[PDB]
Write a protein that binds this DNA or RNA. Sequence first.
RNA 1: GGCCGUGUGCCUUGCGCCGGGAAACCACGCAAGGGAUGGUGUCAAAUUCGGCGAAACCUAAGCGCCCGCCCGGGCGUAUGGCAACGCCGAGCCAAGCUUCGCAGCCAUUGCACUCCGGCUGCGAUGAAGGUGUAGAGACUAGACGGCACCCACCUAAGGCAAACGCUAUGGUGAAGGCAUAGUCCAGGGAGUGGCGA
RNA 2: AAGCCACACAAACCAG
RNA 3: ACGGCC
Length: 95
Amino acid sequence: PETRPNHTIYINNLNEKIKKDELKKSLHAIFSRFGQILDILVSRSLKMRGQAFVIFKEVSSATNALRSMQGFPFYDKPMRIQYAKTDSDIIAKMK
RNA sequence: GGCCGUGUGCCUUGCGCCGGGAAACCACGCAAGGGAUGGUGUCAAAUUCGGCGAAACCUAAGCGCCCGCCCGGGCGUAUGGCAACGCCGAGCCAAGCUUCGCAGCCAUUGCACUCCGGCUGCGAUGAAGGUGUAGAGACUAGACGGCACCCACCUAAGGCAAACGCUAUGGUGAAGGCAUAGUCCAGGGAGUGGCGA
RNA sequence: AAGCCACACAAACCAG
RNA sequence: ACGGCC
Ligand SMILES: [Mg+2]
Ligand SMILES: [Mg+2]
Ligand SMILES: [Mg+2]
Ligand SMILES: [Mg+2]
Ligand SMILES: [Mg+2]
Ligand SMILES: [Mg+2]
Ligand SMILES: [Mg+2]
Ligand SMILES: [Mg+2]
Ligand SMILES: [Mg+2]
Ligand SMILES: [Mg+2]
């Protein structure tokens, strides 16, 4: 459902078949209609498949992304989003 | 395809030698002999272009010595040659393993910030090994070759044991394939001419 | 010399 | 393999 505020958003239940370099371009464009986007982490590993992290510049870009994009059908799959359960290395090198 | 010799590769035994080993044992120098060298299964492809090295054996231009002197011969010798065979640079290669692509199935609903789940199908790469290396060479197999497993034997690092100790992912069971077993086709047996001394 | 290369080629056989 | 000899 929901967790506690964070710059990065945890997206799962994605389509596991689409390639790493292809999925990044399907994301960076689709979520920038809220604000500026930083980096996007995707791994194909047994543990990390069907999961993606999207890092924004401010909470405003992430909070609006959480509600307006929750459940949105992505490649015939209901995209589930949560707030990141831990701060990302990219942000923790600034704070 | 018999019996003598020569060389060279091979292993056993003996000595070195301390080089990799934890030990077994490999590796290196050499001397002498030929009594011993496990099993099943699996792969047949690449088979190209160059280059260095070679003994016994074959022969004697030059050279030295001699037949006193030239002509002639003779004696020794390879720097000429044949060649068992030892290899190097680039390429290339079946199966199996190293690591990445792409497809398919199997799982997986998973919180990460360094990379990563398992198989079967092609694709490329990595380490072996093979080709290059046959009498010029062509085609067939499987073995003595590659790969998997098994057994016999030796050792036991590590892992297991309180412990006498147990256990191999370690080693040993030769080389031959610079054509082995075979079909060819050269080559000699069996000619002619060129080069050479 | 020994051998090497080019044509030409009878048989068993020797033949890597 | 390379010399002999059968
Ligand atoms: Mg014997
Ligand atoms: Mg064949
Ligand atoms: Mg002589
Ligand atoms: Mg003279
Ligand atoms: Mg060659
Ligand atoms: Mg050949
Ligand atoms: Mg061969
Ligand atoms: Mg041979
Ligand atoms: Mg033969
Ligand atoms: Mg030969």
